RNA sequence: UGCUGAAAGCAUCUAAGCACGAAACUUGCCCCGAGAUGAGUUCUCCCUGACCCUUUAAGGGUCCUGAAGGAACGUUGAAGA
RNA sequence: CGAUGUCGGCUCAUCACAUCCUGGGGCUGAAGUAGGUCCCAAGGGUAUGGCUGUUCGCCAUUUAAAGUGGUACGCGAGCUG
RNA sequence: GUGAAGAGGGAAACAACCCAGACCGCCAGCUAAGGUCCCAAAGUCAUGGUUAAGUGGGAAACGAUGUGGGAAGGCCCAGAC
């Protein structure tokens, strides 16, 4: 016998959210990229969809340990003449909360486009609530 | 480390209401202040205090160290507060309080125009003379330091806002 | 002012403080030796 | 800020009594009709839609048509929805014509830029020709500043290339109010608007304090 | 530029706790911009159909009836190699 | 060694900061107007002619800067000789 | 001594340095160097000390009560900073 093969008629869909009350972002990033790559459910391929899909419950409720607040510098680049532009946790928690969660998982995630196949199942929101009511997302512990 | 070990004492005048982490204090200054023993824990015995660490929160004996001179400030700051020392120099210069907004001449194109923070009044008995009242040890001596940061003193002239001290930074002129 | 790279305690009125990571001179008798880093 | 679609005529001199003769561009107005009256009822905002003149409208479409229909009896010129500010601006009471130039004298106008052709460099972006002197031929006027050496690689929009350039929106805000009359629907300013004649002119108060 | 203040009785802008501020900068203005594949919104307009065969859960044929609209084809231009 | 054509000029900018002009703080043997002069920062800004191939060096006249530098010590499928 | 005329695993890179020698197939297992956060597989490893610098993962004089552990010396319970 062989081992398991994946066929694409094998892909499953199920619904999840977790809280994030007084979580530090590198430590829910880990879990949060853990379960959208599906390892509970389905692995051994890349040729076959595995993940699950995911919301993290309200951004504005997460950490960051210590004075790290203000470490990092966020560098990016593409063109317009020189200048490199920058970014701090202090700038974007105030802005859009959602934002610093949505960057964190780009270096756990695979690759090019293999990631971002995982990243199509993400969701995160502000304010308490979410917009899924309908899909039945099912609670995360701890 | 040896701080927290001091009574502390109280004036007859507070009478020292406790829950939880929630310490109730008033008295003759107008003032009702609820201050937090959150990560460290305070006991009264009517006259004195003692401090003491918290389970979960920092060991030994240094951040009960500070808590002592915060809720010794909020005692005196319910009872009568704390005295004068800002001082004005300067022919013509003035200050003056409108209200919650305050007002400083130093000869210049406007008179600063600026509006006080939260829990804090502005009084002048004479023009030259910046008193600041209310029962946090903090926001008056914060006032004070963002008033005095206009145009700065000046080094001959001696003009401008500066505080009762013995230190002269007034300089005297050279022969040339 | 100056910064120079080196400190020296040459007076009684000068004890030199450190503040918010970085350590400077004031001397209340004589603003002359104010002097940045060390 | 609700602009009022002029449409662009010409300049004339005014004069005064100092012999000075004052050039001032020309504006004639025609105002809005108004024709939707948005509130709350999408994304929270309110906006005007303030549909300009009339038009003879003589081969339109069902899907205008219906919205005329809506809008009143007689067809207007444009739509400009005109998003309003909460507190500084209204739609209430009467709608409003020049009382807009009553006390603000500065201005902003957009319209449509004219069409350059192969637009260039050393007339559009104010670079220098070659000289036809000391035996140079072959390359006097044509495009070649745009490296080194090896080093640059990518490039950046200081470099400047030939293709077609006009035709979009373009705005002004050198302008200002010499006379308004309200009674004749004139606005006379002093500098020149873009374009040709006719066009739109949308003219609006300045927002700069 | 800093306040209240400990570790290090004092002293301190920092450790716990919280402020000011540059010709710089985000929003604001002016222009671009939903391939923003995360492709968003809303209004105005329109169409209310059947049959045969087969190695077909799919293809190949025929007929009724084509809206709202778009383009070609023209007369050319404020647009243009 | 089966060839990254020679110096300066014109065209053309663009990056650095041990900052030249602009800003921020300061000591002065800075009473005031000027002057001397050190930290902090790359948003915006920094001369033409004579002889001379010479940029340059010298000079004439001008600056808020004509700053100190990097760019195959920035110039040819770009030009002049 | 290896390489020059010796592949393979490791040092993500790197004739040679480290480890180890190449018949061919394994629906095998045990070991070498090296690795065990995460792209990227195997400790979110255990015990104790060190540590605000993101040093670790580029850098000296010197300076601060930097800071863990120690002994000798002065100031000292009749009494010291």
Same mark, same amino acid.
């Given at each position: 016998?062989?081992?398991?093969?994946?066929?694409?008629?094998?892909?499953?869909?199920?619904?999840?959210?977790?809280?994030?009350?007084?979580?530090?972002?590198?430590?829910?990033?880990?879990?949060?990229?853990?379960?959208?790559?599906?390892?509970?459910?389905?692995?051994?391929?890349?040729?076959?969809?595995?993940?699950?899909?995911?919301?993290?419950?309200?951004?504005?409720? $997460?950490?960051?340990?210590?004075?790290?607040?203000?470490?990092? $510098?966020?560098?990016?680049?593409?063109?317009?003449?020189?200048?490199?532009?920058?970014?701090?946790?202090?700038?974007?928690?105030?802005?859009?909360?959602?934002? $610093?969660?949505?960057?964190? $998982?780009?270096?756990?995630?695979?690759?090019?486009?293999?990631?971002?196949?995982?990243?199509?199942?993400?969701?995160?929101?502000?304010?308490?609530?979410?917009?899924?009511?309908? @899909? @039945?997302?099912?609670?995360?512990?701890? | 480390?040896?701080?927290?070990?001091?009574?502390?004492?109280?004036?007859?005048?507070?009478?020292?209401?406790?829950?939880?982490?929630?310490?109730?204090?008033?008295?003759?200054?107008?003032?009702?202040?609820?201050?937090?023993?959150?990560?460290?824990?305070?006991?009264?015995?009517?006259?004195?205090?003692?401090?003491?660490?918290?389970?979960?929160?920092?060991?030994?004996?240094?951040?009960?160290?500070?808590?002592?001179?915060?809720?010794?400030?909020?005692?005196?700051?319910?009872?009568?507060?704390?005295?004068?020392?800002?001082?004005?120099?300067?022919?013509?210069?003035?200050?003056?309080?409108?209200?919650?907004?305050?007002?400083?001449?130093?000869?210049?194109?406007?008179?600063?125009?600026?509006?006080?923070?939260?829990?804090?009044?502005?009084?002048?008995?004479?023009?030259?003379?910046?008193?600041?009242?209310?029962?946090?040890?903090?926001?008056?001596?914060?006032?004070?330091?963002?008033?005095?940061?206009?145009?700065?003193?000046?080094?001959?002239?001696?003009?401008?806002?500066?505080?009762?001290?013995?230190?002269?930074?007034?300089?005297?002129?050279?022969?040339? | 002012?100056?910064?120079?790279?080196?400190?020296?305690?040459?007076?009684?009125?000068?004890?030199?403080?450190?503040?918010?990571?970085?350590?400077?001179?004031?001397?209340?008798?004589?603003?002359?030796?104010?002097?940045?880093?060390? | 800020?609700?602009?009022?679609?002029?449409?662009?005529?010409?300049?004339?001199?005014?004069?005064?009594?100092?012999?000075?003769?004052?050039?001032?561009?020309?504006?004639?107005?025609?105002?809005?009709?108004?024709?939707?009256?948005?509130?709350?009822?999408?994304?929270?905002?309110?906006?005007?839609?303030?549909?300009?003149?009339?038009?003879?409208?003589?081969?339109?479409?069902?899907?205008?048509?219906?919205?005329?229909?809506?809008?009143?009896?007689?067809?207007?010129?444009?739509?400009?929805?005109?998003?309003?500010?909460?507190?500084?601006?209204?739609?209430?009471?009467?709608?409003?014509?020049?009382?807009?130039?009553?006390?603000?004298?500065?201005?902003?106008?957009?319209?449509?830029?004219?069409?350059?052709?192969?637009?260039?460099?050393?007339?559009?972006?104010?670079?220098?020709?070659?000289?036809?002197?000391?035996?140079?031929?072959?390359?006097?006027?044509?495009?070649?500043?745009?490296?080194?050496?090896?080093?640059?690689?990518?490039?950046?929009?200081?470099?400047?290339?030939?293709?077609?350039?006009?035709?979009?929106?373009?705005?002004?805000?050198?302008?200002?109010?010499?006379?308004?009359?309200?009674?004749?629907?004139?606005?006379?300013?002093?500098?020149?608007?873009?374009?040709?004649?006719?066009?739109?002119?949308?003219?609006?108060?300045?927002?700069?304090?």
């Amino acid at each position: 016998m062989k081992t398991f093969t994946a066929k694409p008629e094998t892909v499953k869909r199920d619904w999840y959210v977790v809280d994030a009350t007084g979580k530090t972002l590198g430590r829910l990033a880990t879990e949060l990229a853990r379960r959208l790559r599906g390892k509970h459910k389905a692995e051994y391929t890349p040729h076959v969809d595995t993940g699950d899909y995911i919301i993290v419950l309200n951004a504005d409720k $997460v950490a960051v340990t210590g004075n790290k607040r203000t470490d990092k $510098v966020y560098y990016h680049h593409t063109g317009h003449i020189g200048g490199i532009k920058q970014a701090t946790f202090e700038e974007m928690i105030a802005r859009r909360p959602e934002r $610093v969660i949505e960057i964190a $998982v780009k270096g756990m995630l695979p690759k090019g486009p293999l990631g971002r196949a995982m990243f199509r199942k993400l969701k995160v929101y502000a304010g308490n609530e979410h917009n899924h009511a309908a @899909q @039945q997302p099912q609670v995360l512990d701890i | 480390s040896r701080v927290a070990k001091a009574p502390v004492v109280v004036p007859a005048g507070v009478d020292v209401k406790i829950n939880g982490q929630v310490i109730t204090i008033k008295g003759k200054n107008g003032e009702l202040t609820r201050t937090l023993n959150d990560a460290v824990e305070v006991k009264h015995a009517d006259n004195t205090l003692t401090f003491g660490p918290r389970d979960g929160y920092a060991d030994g004996w240094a951040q009960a160290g500070t808590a002592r001179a915060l809720l010794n400030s909020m005692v005196i700051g319910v009872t009568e507060g704390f005295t004068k020392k800002l001082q004005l120099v300067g022919v013509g210069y003035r200050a003056a309080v409108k209200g919650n907004v305050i007002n400083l001449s130093l000869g210049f194109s406007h008179p600063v125009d600026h509006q006080l923070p939260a829990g804090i009044t502005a009084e002048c008995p004479t023009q030259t003379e910046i008193v600041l009242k209310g029962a946090d040890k903090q926001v008056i001596g914060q006032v004070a330091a963002d008033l005095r940061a206009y145009r700065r003193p000046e080094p001959y002239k001696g003009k401008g806002v500066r505080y009762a001290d013995e230190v002269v930074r007034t300089k005297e002129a050279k022969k040339k | 002012m100056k910064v120079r790279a080196s400190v020296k305690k040459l007076c009684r009125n000068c004890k030199i403080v450190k503040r918010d990571g970085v350590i400077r001179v004031i001397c209340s008798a004589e603003p002359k030796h104010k002097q940045r880093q060390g | 800020m609700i602009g009022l679609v002029g449409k662009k005529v010409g300049m004339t001199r005014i004069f005064t009594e100092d012999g000075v003769s004052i050039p001032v561009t020309v504006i004639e107005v025609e105002a809005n009709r108004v024709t939707q009256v948005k509130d709350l009822a999408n994304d929270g905002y309110r906006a005007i839609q303030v549909t300009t003149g009339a038009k003879k409208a003589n081969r339109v479409t069902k899907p205008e048509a219906g919205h005329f229909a809506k809008a009143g009896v007689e067809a207007g010129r444009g739509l400009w929805e005109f998003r309003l500010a909460e507190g500084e601006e209204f739609t209430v009471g009467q709608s409003i014509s020049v009382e807009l130039f009553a006390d603000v004298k500065k201005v902003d106008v957009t319209g449509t830029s004219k069409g350059k052709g192969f637009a260039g460099t050393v007339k559009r972006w104010n670079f220098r020709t070659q000289d036809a002197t000391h035996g140079n031929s072959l390359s006097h006027r044509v495009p070649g500043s745009i490296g080194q050496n090896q080093t640059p690689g990518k490039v950046f929009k200081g470099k400047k290339m030939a293709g077609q350039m006009g035709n979009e929106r373009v705005t002004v805000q050198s302008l200002d109010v010499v006379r308004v009359d309200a009674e004749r629907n004139l606005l006379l300013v002093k500098g020149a608007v873009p374009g040709a004649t006719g066009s739109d002119l949308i003219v609006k108060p300045a927002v700069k304090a």
